[PDB]
Design a binder for this molecule. Structure first.
Ligand code: NGA
Ligand code: CL
Length: 253
């Protein structure tokens, strides 16, 4: 009659920061100081072409950063490790330089979310990702956490998991989750622990509500330490689902 292991709320926050747009996230952060939030921001598939993001980002990001239970990460694309590593490094360094380039201590992130990491094992690809982790851990401006997340959007070879602090090993519809027998899918992953794993479930039917939603949250908390669940089928990373506060309430329980 408990919810099992506690998980963090993972938020791919690709809502454009117009005035008020991030209010639903700030509200639940405020309501649940005991809950830990991992929040990815993404000005333009990366930090953007300049040293600093636009006026809306520069206003809103520090408001989120001001909460102790928020861990902000900068989105960086890797294009299945095919992207030139110097260009990836440029993006990491740009995020890292944000607080000093802005003279705003709170215009900063605490790590990097690497999108599109590949599933298939390859030694050269492992070396690429490990170097990227070294860059994140070693660069001023990404502290204190220097957090690293990989998003293969599917289960990668287990040898990749130790290179990141968290790996998104599920990112698909609720229907796909169900086709794969839910939490059972996570049991197939060798050399792994829930603490290394993130699950993203979108397109949840609005009928999965109340105790039905509690059940899903509990099932996923058992196997993944970071979780995003939303009932949106469209723009599920660019808006809040109709049961966003209920989802966070369950994560807090
Ligand atoms: C959970 C997550 O982050 N998914 C990414 C998202 O960041 C965005 O890049 C999207 C379209 O660009 O592609 C997905 O791979
Ligand atoms: Cl929708």
């Amino acid at each position: 009659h408990m919810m099992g292991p506690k998980s963090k709320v993972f938020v791919p926050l690709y809502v454009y920061p117009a005035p008020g747009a991030w209010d639903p996230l700030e509200d639940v952060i405020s309501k649940h100081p005991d809950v830990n939030f991992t929040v990815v921001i993404n000005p333009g598939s990366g930090p953007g072409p300049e040293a600093l993001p636009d006026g809306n980002y520069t206003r809103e990001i520090p408001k989120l950063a001001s909460y102790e239970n928020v861990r902000l990460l900068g989105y960086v694309a890797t294009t299945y490790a095919k992207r030139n590593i110097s260009e990836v490094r440029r993006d990491i360094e740009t995020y890292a330089a944000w607080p000093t380039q802005s003279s705003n201590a709170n215009l900063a992130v605490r790590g990097i979310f690497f999108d599109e990491t590949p599933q298939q094992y390859d030694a050269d690809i492992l070396a690429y990702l490990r170097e990227l982790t070294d860059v994140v851990k070693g660069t001023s401006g990404l502290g204190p956490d220097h957090y690293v997340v990989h998003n293969p959007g599917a289960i990668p070879d287990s040898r990749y998991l130790s290179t990141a602090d968290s790996t998104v090993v599920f990112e698909a519809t609720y229907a796909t989750f169900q086709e794969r027998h839910g939490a059972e899918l996570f049991d197939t992953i060798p050399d792994s622990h829930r603490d290394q794993l993130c699950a993203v479930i979108h397109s949840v039917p609005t009928s999965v509500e109340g105790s039905d939603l509690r059940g899903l949250v509990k099932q996923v908390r058992q196997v993944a330490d970071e979780i995003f669940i939303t009932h949106l089928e469209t723009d599920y990373y660019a808006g809040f689902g109709g049961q966003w506060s209920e989802f966070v309430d369950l994560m807090a329980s």
